[PDB]
Symmetry: D2
Subunit: 497 residues, 4 copies
């Protein structure tokens, strides 16, 4: 019997043809070294499906350019690249430093103020932290984690109402404006602060496709986001970023009430042990798989390619095992944001994603997933899992989903067929929005030009002809056609003509 992965690894051979449709999706973070149309085209061409604007930095005019360029680059290449707005959030940062940085030393005693006068002239003996309620929330004995939690200062006493005496436990030199975390204090900051509310309204007007919501801990907080986007942005997706343990603990309620998860390894790892982050990843990705919402593998992906032409052995296994975990998206930050090799990172990630995938036990995923759905299931759920089951039964070589919001294509993608899925939509912003779901590819069908398509056949042909041109289907091959969402519900098996 060919039950589960172990059984499957025994057949696999690396010398066999790399089965060619890359399911996994790549997000890049745009920044100084990739903002230009020209360099964006390269990103698209290397394998980007999502541009990620990071609102922790840059004016609106900045991001506005990133928005205009992405659109133009994409239009020139004739593809659809989803734009994502990534929330600043309830961030806590240190001030700047005189000279480059600090040089925090071990034995050292140092001072930390919430006095803004020390922002523009920070020093390694005393520096700024922008969290105004710092000295009203911290006791002596507590630690302040700085710079990805790699620098730890214990708090010793209150120098003044605004300044903190601090011992320096760890030691390492640190750059301008770094990530501060206060374990064991209620950080009162709201998940959608004054700035975010205006950042998110900017995103709605500009027609972003999704939000990457930073530091979500509450099921209730995802609510504050939805509300701040307003009804004029009821259709924009909310992809919650899990960054702290409060978020892991509340993953279920957060998933039940969101559109997807980004598993932010870097941040979790600030106060979660690095080895436990590995498990955390597995748990998060799989909860998402089961729920059928998109999940993104987060930070420190191919980290060495920010400054080197070739990634390290380990970095590679990290990407591969991310796919194996069951990731929809892998993502790059600095590597493409400020990196010295923006095309090469994306290309190489694409290759690793392609490989890993073609070695996965595609089936088990489906079977495992089916076995966990509550029966009796909703028509459209059954409609999809049966279609996927049909793919497997017939060895069908492509699926054509006619989907208009994405619901269907996303709920099919849930059941992991061993073939490419081709989504055909009259909504362009669906094409974009399906760039975070694995294995789906979107073919736009223009209802303004090519008619209303009542008989629904014109759109199905459009899907097959695409599938045909991509190499998925040849005259003879089978093809599972599905439509879900009183009509709705419908599946054909087509003989590709």
């Amino acid at each position: 019997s060919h039950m589960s992965q172990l059984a499957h690894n025994l057949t696999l051979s690396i010398f066999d043809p790399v089965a060619n449709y890359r399911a996994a999706r790549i997000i890049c973070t745009i920044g100084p070294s990739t903002q230009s149309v020209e360099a964006l085209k390269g990103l698209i061409q290397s394998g980007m499906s999502v541009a990620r604007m990071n609102f922790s930095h840059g004016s609106h005019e900045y991001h506005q350019t990133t928005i205009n360029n992405v659109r133009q680059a994409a239009a020139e290449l004739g593809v659809n690249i989803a734009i994502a707005l990534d929330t600043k959030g309830p961030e806590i940062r240190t001030g700047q430093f005189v000279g480059g940085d600090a040089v925090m030393e071990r034995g050292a005693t140092c001072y930390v103020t919430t006095d803004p006068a020390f922002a523009d002239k920070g020093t390694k003996d005393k520096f700024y932290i922008d969290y105004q309620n710092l000295s009203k929330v911290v006791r002596p004995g507590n630690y302040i984690y700085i710079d990805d939690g790699i620098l730890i200062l214990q708090v010793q006493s209150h120098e003044d109402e605004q300044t903190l005496e601090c011992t320096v436990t760890n030691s390492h030199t640190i750059s301008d404006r770094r990530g501060v975390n206060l374990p064991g204090c209620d950080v009162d900051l709201p998940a959608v602060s004054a700035k975010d509310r205006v950042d998110l309204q900017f995103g709605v007007e500009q027609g972003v496709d999704m939000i990457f919501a930073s530091f979500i801990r509450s099921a209730e907080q995802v609510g504050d986001v939805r509300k701040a986007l307003g009804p004029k942005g009821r259709d924009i997706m909310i992809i919650c970023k899990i960054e702290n343990h409060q978020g892991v603990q509340n993953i279920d309620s957060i998933i039940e009430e969101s559109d997807g998860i980004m598993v932010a390894r870097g941040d979790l790892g600030v106060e979660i042990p690095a080895e436990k982050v590995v498990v955390a990843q597995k748990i998060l990705i799989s909860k998402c798989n089961v729920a059928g919402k998109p999940v993104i593998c987060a930070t420190q992906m191919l980290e060495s390619m920010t400054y080197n032409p070739r990634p390290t052995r380990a970095e590679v296994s990290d990407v591969a095992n991310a796919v194996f975990n069951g990731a929809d998206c892998v993502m790059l930050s600095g590597e493409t944001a400020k990196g010295k090799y923006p095309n090469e990172v994306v290309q190489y990630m694409a290759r690793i994603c392609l490989e890993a995938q073609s070695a996965l036990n595609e089936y088990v995923f489906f079977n495992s997933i089916k076995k966990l759905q509550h029966i009796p299931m909703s028509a459209d759920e059954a409609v999809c899992s049966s279609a996927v089951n049909s793919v497997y039964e017939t060895k069908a070589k492509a699926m054509v989903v006619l989907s208009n919001t994405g619901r269907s294509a996303r709920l099919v993608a849930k059941y992991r067929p061993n073939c490419p899925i081709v989504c055909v939509t009259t909504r362009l912003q669906t094409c974009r929005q399906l760039n975070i779901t694995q294995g789906v590819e979107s073919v736009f069908f223009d209802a303004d030009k090519l008619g209303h398509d009542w008989g629904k056949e014109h759109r199905v042909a459009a899907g097959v002809e695409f599938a045909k041109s991509k190499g998925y289907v040849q005259t003879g091959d089978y093809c599972v056609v599905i439509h879900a969402d009183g009509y709705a519900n419908q599946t054909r098996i087509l003989l590709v003509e």
Copy 2:
């Protein structure tokens, strides 16, 4: 965990409402006590779906009458009753006896002859056997089996070219013209005798729906029967009767080449031990479910109700278990042909079938069958097996299968959904012909009167309405629609 029948048994309570819609189908043998339109109406009304005509008896005129009445009775009630023409076959029989019977006592010597002169005036001391090359095929020491093999004669020598000296081993008294079996001789008779060919042509002209071909041993003999049916009957269903051990052996090549099987326990029992025949049944019924072609639990069904008002505690278990094995159909012979209780026999069998069926693990069938299909499967095969899988996932209280030849209805029927299957046909014969396939009902759709229906949605509506008015589905209930040959599945939210 709930994997198989044992698990399922622990939850069942006999006191629970009996899931209505008897899946199994009933075949009756028409004869003197059921030929009247009047009696046939009661038979139909009692639970009959298939009227079997046994051509081992009666002129064409007799069966013309059977057909005419079966038809008119059914037409009057507004139902579709399939007519089976049961082949005579390669039958060996004895002649007649002076007075009712024989009276074979034990160590007695008797003479068996192939001389037709003795056919009308036979005796316990010497009588006729119609198979002409009897003497030319039998060695001394062979047993001659008579009357469902309950009387065994041993052959001692040839008295002349036409007569055999026989010793009597079993003692029983025997009626006129009983079945004769010769174990261990080449019974050279054709599987389609010259008489069979005319009977079969008579079948094609009167528009029978199927042949119940007796004594099939070959892959190739099923051919012989089709070639005899001619091209004007290219559509008539051949059901192969498995009646002997040469038959069980070749069951596989036979199934692969026929439209269905009848497990004739009585005839298998002539020279296979009863206990073995039980297992034979089990094999043949499962071999047919996986093959997806009909199977009929054949003989001696509810036997004592030929002449008693109520059947025996055993006869019932025997029926219950027939449905449990996975039979499509249950057939009566003597009970309805000559029977003193033709209605009550069908009603009781109706009731037993409903009960057993409603206590069977429907799912374990589906899955067990799904996991025995060689992948990759042909589109419609998958389309159906997944359409069923859709049912179990949604607890859909009905299915609507639009099928023209019955192929699709039959292929869904194979995967045992736990609900009524409602077929819609634009061919009337498909309605009759589906009466041997389990848990399916047919709604006819007159493409002549009600339009040719392109969008195939007028037809669905009808299939749904039926289901709605049979009690199967209401507003809110889910319903699975399927058409194959092509390929299309909907899940309807019945309004």
Copy 3:
């Protein structure tokens, strides 16, 4: 190879029968089989359990059965269990003038509780032994005489002891027949004062098990136990399920008793016959998962009471009782008053052997396995993991050392595809194991052949039996198990 259906495709009727019947046969003793010569025949035809029906005959009569069975079995060097089937809360009609009655339909008739009318009853007025009948019966209620194929309907009280009754179903009735009262409180004690003495008789005579009649409560079993005394703590209690009051309770009744008997006939009194079949499946599958013995009970090979061969259906009935999962099949009238007691059993052997050797053995082991609460008790794991070892090695026999039978019964629970050979110091264990399928019991006399502190001697005797019955040869594998402490060997039969 998941399920039976899949397995059925591979079977062939022309393949040799695997020689070892696993199901066990119980025969009821009566006039035609009480003699040592008749019992010898019965044993050799394949009887495993002498059933004494205490509804009929004195102790002296039953004493004779007990003495004669013992003497028969001994002469053949075999061990035969002895069941004391209980009378219980029976209601019977009185006697009749001339053979029977002949109840015709539209007839009005009279049913008394007055004892005077016992030995001289007619079809116009006849006795019923239930004293409180008239006090528990509203007019309109049906009375069910004779396995409930004669249905009276009550019309009024002619007096305190007599009921006016209209006759519904018309069929003639013999002497003294089973009366049943649907929808009344039959106040009859499960263990009655006459039953008390009966049970104690069995305790003194060393019967091996009781077939307690008409069990309705988990508690009623208690009544049987409390009456067997502390001197009969070892006697097995098999509950007979004879009514819907006991089908509904089957669950708690299994959890308390030592095993079930599925009395199809007496269930069939008011439960429609078709359902009885399903009830049969449920009870057997329930006992099976519980790992306690279950007997398919009445109306078995019913025509072989007067005929030399059974009816087609009477065969399927037996065959299906084995597939259903039963440990035992029973014969009542067929062996008790039958004309062909030997031939009756000899078919039942043959049918059992046939059914049993076509029955997918694995699907059982797996089905029961996948229904046990985890974590399971050591002894439980021990056996299942041994039966697992059996399938993994294709081991051709098992050897269980059990002193009470517990271990053997827990091995037999998980259905290996081979014989189980039990080895015991207790003789009563040999007998007691005659109702659990797939086991054969070898006596090992701790008295004459030493105590066996190594267990190595009893095991040689296990294998040696196995080897002799043609189960295992030099080369074969034998799974050796001892539970309760908790040990399992896989032997390479020398």
Copy 4:
């Protein structure tokens, strides 16, 4: 609840870590961990195997490694395995004047086989030790240098010993680096004269296992056993899979060797990085199914050679080596020339502990069982059934009496959710089990504490170890097993 996906849904990181590390850690001893003081520290941090890399250093040197490992583990009263990793058919470049070369791009450079260039090479012409190099290479061929990251193209033969080469890739290369020749029959024998001598030294010093290099062929393993000779028959042969010829022949190789090491580094030379990941899965799962130890091998925690903390990716990579199914993880240079040798092992242990205590155990047990041929031999079944018992009973530890250690190794194969405690009279079994996951050895001296014929003393010692490690308590169940015969017990720990 079927597979990892289902199990992942339950898991939470805040559920306390299970306190037993199954994964085993091998360290390559080098110039920074050869002292007893340093070896104590390694062991204490979690090293189970000292690897002697014979590509470098004299016999004298490794003699020192052998003596110290011995003495350190004796002082700490622990049993520590000594592995001899073989040089094999290595192709290496000579030394360079200055530190190294600095290969700039499209520049012509020369390659000699002429020894007189070995000690004084330049970036313009340098030595390579393979003699038939120029007899075996065509113009148009590639010479790979330094684990792949420098590619030369052969242009023409300057002379019988010198190749003209264009430099394709630009990176500088240190002293004596590895040379590879793709699409050339590298003829060198798998066990060379120098290796033959090396192995005999191994045998004489009582190494416990060989880490044989560049194993391409099922019958090259044969050559290693021939060189080890009859005096070293009981030394294990762990074949290193290092080239693609070995990934193809893994099947024939595994079934013929004792175990597999997965040398990502050298596999990575001509096999694209992302494929190696897959080859790792394939090689690991293959061994698990075969029941032989597999070791994840190169570039493990690579940055901790120079840094006090690993990277995020390095951690993932270790973790996944456990999820993939490795028995062992190895550190090469990190403990050899490392600057944080203890901390390297410490961090590694910790990772392996985390990964494993979230690694669905039961799926391994089934994945493997459902892949063994039936009918399996008694000891196979005795072991699988034992584990099945472990699961049915939620037993908290196992105890194997195994002398050569076959049975322990063959139990570990089925992956119980408890620690395995192996008990042995043979000291060398204790060390040799240092490479199978989730097993610990207790040495039972047959010379001081009697022979123990009834095995009862040895089981006590089994359970006591268990007890003192906080695995089993007065109350918990413990599965005892001895195979090769074939006996399983479930003990209620006293």
